[PDB]
Amino acid sequence: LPLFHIALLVLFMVIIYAIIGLELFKGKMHKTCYYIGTDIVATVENEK
Amino acid sequence: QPKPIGVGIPTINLRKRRPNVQNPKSQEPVTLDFLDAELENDIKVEIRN
């Protein structure tokens, strides 16, 4: 019970840092590294 | 006539392959039926049997 002045910070700090991410980074993650005309992702053995 | 036999409709997608590996060459024999090497007839089946 002496932590809901501290846990209320991160929950307000997430809501701050979620919306900043959602404005700046909206939908950047979609472009591919596929092959020539096919449907395989192109990675190198260890790479995500 | 070389060129082995007998498949359904030969479906290939080109979305699945890679610009790569050799795609095996079918160790399948060429076993042609006599009733499919020619026209089928009531006389020839008597000959074949």
Curated annotation (Swiss-Prot), chain A:
<comment type="similarity">
    <text>Belongs to the calcium channel alpha-1 subunit (TC 1.A.1.11) family. CACNA1S subfamily.</text>
</comment>
<feature type="transmembrane region" description="Helical; Name=S5 of repeat I">
    <location>
        <begin position="4"/>
        <end position="25"/>
    </location>
</feature>
<comment type="subunit">
    <text>Component of a calcium channel complex consisting of a pore-forming alpha subunit (CACNA1S) and the ancillary subunits CACNB1 or CACNB2, CACNG1 and CACNA2D1. The channel complex contains alpha, beta, gamma and delta subunits in a 1:1:1:1 ratio, i.e. it contains either CACNB1 or CACNB2. CACNA1S channel activity is modulated by the auxiliary subunits (CACNB1 or CACNB2, CACNG1 and CACNA2D1). Interacts with DYSF and JSRP1. Interacts with RYR1. Interacts with STAC, STAC2 and STAC3 (via their SH3 domains). Interaction with STAC3 promotes expression at the cell membrane.</text>
</comment>
<protein>
    <recommendedName>
        <fullName>Voltage-dependent L-type calcium channel subunit alpha-1S</fullName>
    </recommendedName>
</protein>
<comment type="function">
    <text>Pore-forming, alpha-1S subunit of the voltage-gated calcium channel that gives rise to L-type calcium currents in skeletal muscle. Calcium channels containing the alpha-1S subunit play an important role in excitation-contraction coupling in skeletal muscle via their interaction with RYR1, which triggers Ca(2+) release from the sarcplasmic reticulum and ultimately results in muscle contraction. Long-lasting (L-type) calcium channels belong to the 'high-voltage activated' (HVA) group.</text>
</comment>
Curated annotation (Swiss-Prot), chain B:
<protein>
    <recommendedName>
        <fullName>Voltage-dependent calcium channel subunit alpha-2/delta-1</fullName>
    </recommendedName>
</protein>
<comment type="subunit">
    <text>Dimer formed of alpha-2-1 and delta-1 chains; disulfide-linked. Voltage-dependent calcium channels are multisubunit complexes, consisting of alpha-1 (CACNA1), alpha-2 (CACNA2D), beta (CACNB) and delta (CACNA2D) subunits in a 1:1:1:1 ratio.</text>
</comment>
<comment type="similarity">
    <text>Belongs to the calcium channel subunit alpha-2/delta family.</text>
</comment>
<comment type="function">
    <text>The alpha-2/delta subunit of voltage-dependent calcium channels regulates calcium current density and activation/inactivation kinetics of the calcium channel. Plays an important role in excitation-contraction coupling.</text>
</comment>
